[PDB]
Design a protein around this ligand. Structure first.
Ligand SMILES: Nc1nc2c(ncn2[C@@H]2O[C@H](COP(=O)(O)OP(=O)(O)NP(=O)(O)O)[C@@H](O)[C@H]2O)c(=O)[nH]1
Ligand SMILES: C[C@@H](Nc1nc(Nc2ccc(F)c(Cl)c2)nc2c(C3=CCNCC3)cccc12)C1CC1
Ligand SMILES: [Mg+2]
Ligand code: NA
Lengths: 166, 469, 167
């Protein structure tokens, strides 16, 4: 059993915790309890191989913005999450991308761009704009809903595959 | 340079690390032993977060620190003094200018705010995942509400207000799937006819599914509070470990029911049908990764009343002998193949709990509470980490729910199963063994014949599922 | 090569039974243990000049799984029946453990030893004469052990191996 260290990052309120708890427990969290730092484990078979996912769920609130280097050092791949009804959260993605690259001193860090809350009709970030950004990073773009489970396994397990082949 | 710290005389958590107060294992450090002050410092360290350590500590700390004392210590940790103005700040103020306060601003940003946030993360994890401390001590809860409710200042405000609401919700205290669950399967007993339910009249697929839902729910209900301190073995086990004991008593009752179904079927041909049906239920348990259910069957077949039934065993079809042998071999060599299989499957699963209990107990009993170093007694934290590795494995398999539909009547039938009746254990297991001797006497006594007891067909419907439109 | 003996520890829970195998298999001289370590219940020893391998099954903590006792007992060639010298109930349980072993092994003469274990400083309630009399009525050896000083631990296991060898 290979172990994989995944880290979920992005602006406050985009659904990092809801995505993670949907993956771990098959439950949608309605409350908005801002995270400081949480960690989860999941044994799962991906492409016929059993592994153990360690998932770090990080703080999006700006008051925690000086505490990120410590978790970026440990992570092997990153889910970069924004919400498709929150343009500021999409503009915040590049700050996370640049900090991860600096901390890990690498242009080639496993990452997936995640556009969450895709169950909501009132979109303000178009898929094309997010896909363009993802291509500029060399990474896939996956739209998700922590509420309905749409795309949730695809997002996390695509990240595992990129760590596996790194 | 590193930030200067408050004097250790006014703030105890600024004492330098030494082997008299902390010992590390041989890229964050792993603590082998330390004083409680050093454990709490590293639990809330300014340089890094350690979420695993928070879980380990909050799961195991009561073996070395009382809950009331832990709260006092983390409040002490939170109350960090700010440094005085520096010479450059002094000179600026003397000239009527605003000081740069560079050292003060850095200490706030890089020491106070991370430590305080990590103290609040301990509080948040404590309330969310270890709330029993507060259920059992209402005054501890009052102290926590008061501490959180009086934290001032904007940097912590979002989390203070959140934690206040979380506490209030915990005081007064839904699943979604990738697909639909399969259709409930029926055999001789039809929906609503609970009086006919029995081993051979319910569908073997649905017996295995409904027992798996029941056993999964029992597994998922066991909290670490029922395990740490080996409390399920002590005199107050019924008070401290009720969900664990309910889970074990279900497993015991099902094993005894299987044994009773076998030996109370006196006709050989009928008894072969009973054993074959139990092995089919075992096959579906294996398909569902219900290892508790697998071992319920394996323990029944290994029992003295059943294991000796050579005439019955001889007539079990070869392919079913192979299924049962494979399941039995999971237990061989101190569960070697079981442990490897559990770590390879795709959950949901229902682990067998017994191995976890033995490993927690032996870890507790085989390691000292303290290490003596340089005349000091240090808390042996490595021992607690080993216990929390086991409780963490347990919790990891408690997360995944089964995509199976409950059948409320079949569920109630297995919930109310009571093979022993009003008999005591020794009485009942002697009865089972004497039944075994009656139906297949010891050689050279001749094998008797017995009348049939079942009026309905014995042919199994099999364990491959059906799917109408 | 060398003979392997499959030994099984049985007895009441909650009274320090596990200390017997832990102290044996331990690094005698470092008080530490990881029971999850593959073959932390196997130990190569020399008994009366003959080297052998002990494989010890101790399911301490699983006592409430009472319908699994037959399965676990079936794995063994020799048995240590353990009670605590300050718990009379655990001593009174011995008769039923022995009867169950005899039934599982289908034999009236199964290699076994009676072990009285001192698990703390609480007052002894089973005197050595009572336990010697019980062991003699069964025709088996009696060994007393300390759960803290390792006294008697080697004697208990080596005596059982001698019972197997002389069966
Ligand atoms: N409709 C909808 N709401 C969602 C979705 N994901 C999260 N939410 C909601 O958005 C809010 C914030 O979710 P949360 O998971 O706490 O966000 P977060 O990114 O972890 N916040 P933080 O960075 O402060 O820890 C909650 O009310 C949650 O129910 C989604 O996919 N759809
Ligand atoms: C796979 C299975 N093995 C064995 N099983 C059984 N019996 C048995 C098993 C299931 C039943 F449903 C009934 Cl009815 C009986 N006897 C055995 C014997 C003998 C015992 C006593 N006489 C000599 C022959 C020898 C070697 C193996 C076995 C294991 C789960 C337990
Ligand atoms: Mg969050
Ligand atoms: Na007593």
């Amino acid at each position: 059993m290979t172990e994989y260290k995944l880290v979920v990052v992005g602006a406050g309120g985009v659904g990092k915790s809801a995505l993670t708890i949907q993956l771990i427990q098959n439950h949608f969290v309605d409350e908005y309890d801002p995270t400081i730092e949480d960690s989860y484990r999941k044994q799962v078979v991906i492409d016929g191989e059993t592994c153990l996912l360690d998932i770090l769920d990080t703080a999006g609130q700006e008051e925690a913005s000086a505490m990120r280097d410590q978790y970026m050092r440990t992570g092997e791949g990153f889910l970069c999450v924004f919400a498709i009804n929150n343009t500021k959260s999409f503009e915040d993605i590049h700050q996370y991308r640049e900090q991860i690259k600096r901390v890990k001193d690498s242009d080639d860090v496993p990452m997936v761009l995640v556009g969450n809350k895709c169950d909501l009709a009132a979109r303000t970030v178009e898929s094309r704009q997010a896909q363009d950004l993802a291509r500029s990073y060399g990474i896939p773009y996956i739209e998700t809903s922590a509420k309905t489970r749409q795309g949730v396994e695809d997002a996390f397990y695509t990240l595992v595959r990129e760590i596996r082949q790194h | 340079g590193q930030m200067r710290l408050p004097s250790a005389d006014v703030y105890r958590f600024a004492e330098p690390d030494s082997e008299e107060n902390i010992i590390f294992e041989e890229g964050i450090p792993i603590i082998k032993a330390g004083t409680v002050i050093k454990l709490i410092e590293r639990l809330t360290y300014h340089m890094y977060a350690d979420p695993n350590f928070v879980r380990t500590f909050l799961t195991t700390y009561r073996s070395f620190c009382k809950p009331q004392e832990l709260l006092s210590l983390i409040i002490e940790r939170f109350e960090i003094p700010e440094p005085e103005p520096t010479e450059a700040d002094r000179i600026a103020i003397e000239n009527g200018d605003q000081p740069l306060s560079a050292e003060l601003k850095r200490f706030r940003k890089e020491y106070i705010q991370p430590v305080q946030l990590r103290v609040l993360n301990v509080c948040r994890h404590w309330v969310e995942h270890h709330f029993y401390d507060f259920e059992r001590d209402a005054y501890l809860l009052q102290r926590m509400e008061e501490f959180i409710g009086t934290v001032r200042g904007k940097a912590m405000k979002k989390w203070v207000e959140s934690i206040t609401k979380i506490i209030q919700r915990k005081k007064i205290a839904n699943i979604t799937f990738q697909s639909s669950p399969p259709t409930v399967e029926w055999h001789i007993s039809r929906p609503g006819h609970i009086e006919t339910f029995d081993l051979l009249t319910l569908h073997p697929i649905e017996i295995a599914r409904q027992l798996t839902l029941l056993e999964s729910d029992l597994y998922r209900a066991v909290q670490p509070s029922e395990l740490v301190g080996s409390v399920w073995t002590k005199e107050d086990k019924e008070i401290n470990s009720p969900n664990l004991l309910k889970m074990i008593r279900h497993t015991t009752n099902l094993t005894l029911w299987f044994e009773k179904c076998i030996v109370e079927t006196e006709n050989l041909e009928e008894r072969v049908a009973v054993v074959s049906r139990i092995i089919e239920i075992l096959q579906v348990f294996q398909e569902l990764n219900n290892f508790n259910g697998v071992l319920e069957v394996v323990s029944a077949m290994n029992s003295s009343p059943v294991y000796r039934l050579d005439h019955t065993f001889e007539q079990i079809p070869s392919r079913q002998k192979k299924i049962l042998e494979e399941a039995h071999e999971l237990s061989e060599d101190h569960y070697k193949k079981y442990l490897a299989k559990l770590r390879s499957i795709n959950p949901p699963c229902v682990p067998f709990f017994g191995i976890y209990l033995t490993n927690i107990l032996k870890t507790e009993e085989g390691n000292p509470e303290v290490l003596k170093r340089h005349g000091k007694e240090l808390i042996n934290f490595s021992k607690r980490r080993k216990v929390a590795e086991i409780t963490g494995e347990i919790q990891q398999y408690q997360n995944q729910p089964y995509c199976l539909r409950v059948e409320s009547d079949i569920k109630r039938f297995f919930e109310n199963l009571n093979p022993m009746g009003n008999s005591m254990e020794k009485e009942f297991t002697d009865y089972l063994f004497n039944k075994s001797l009656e139906i297949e006497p010891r050689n050279p006594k001749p094998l008797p014949r017995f009348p049939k007891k079942y009026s309905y067909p014995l042919k199994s419907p099999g364990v491959r599922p059906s799917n109408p439109r």
